[PDB]
């Protein structure tokens, strides 16, 4: 698991936060993840140790990689131009898992980022610090 939300996980990429969890997506619909701007090709880091469980297109989120951390915690990384890991692999905190792209069809390169606890996307920011 990711443990208490204490700023101990790695930021997946560093850049300006373009959209925050819960912010307006379209009308009164809300984002259920963050969007962090970064140059095309920047490495995306696994935030914590885990198992890669998905590495495929998911409509609305371009190419997504999903890492399970155990005990009901997961992290999701979308809009990537490519994945650097395959489903089934174990990854380490900080390890490169994808490269930033525009596969979500966005206006500029950026990472789509979710943390799901007990199967539900929640604000990821409080875990991020390293
Ligand atoms: Cl898409």
From Swiss-Prot:
Effect on the protein of changing residue 35 to E: Loss of AmiA and AmiB activation; does not complement double envC-nlpD disruption, protein localizes normally
Localization annotation: Periplasm
Consequence of changing residue 32 to E: Loss of AmiA and AmiB activation; does not complement double envC-nlpD disruption, protein localizes normally
Phenotype upon changing residue 32 to A: Retains AmiA and AmiB activation
Superkingdom of origin: Bacteria
Phenotype caused by lack of the gene: Mutants show defects in septation and separation, and form very long filaments (1.5-fold increase). The phenotype is exacerbated when combined with nlpD (over 8-fold longer), more exacerbated with a triple mepM (yebA) or ygeR disruption (15-fold longer) and further yet by the quadruple disruption mutant (envC-nlpD-mepM(yebA)-ygeR, over 21-fold longer). Quadruple mutants are less sensitive to ampicillin lysis.
Domain comment as written in the entry: The coiled-coil domain is necessary and sufficient for recruitment to the divisome. The LytM domain is required for proper septal peptidoglycan splitting.
Role, per record: Activator of the cell wall hydrolases AmiA and AmiB. Required for septal murein cleavage and daughter cell separation during cell division. In vitro, exhibits weak endoproteolytic activity on beta-casein.
Family assignment from sequence similarity: Belongs to the peptidase M23B family.
Name recorded for this polypeptide: Murein hydrolase activator EnvC
Record lineage: Bacteria, Pseudomonadati, Pseudomonadota, Gammaproteobacteria, Enterobacterales
Full-length numbering of the shown residues: 290 to 419 of 419
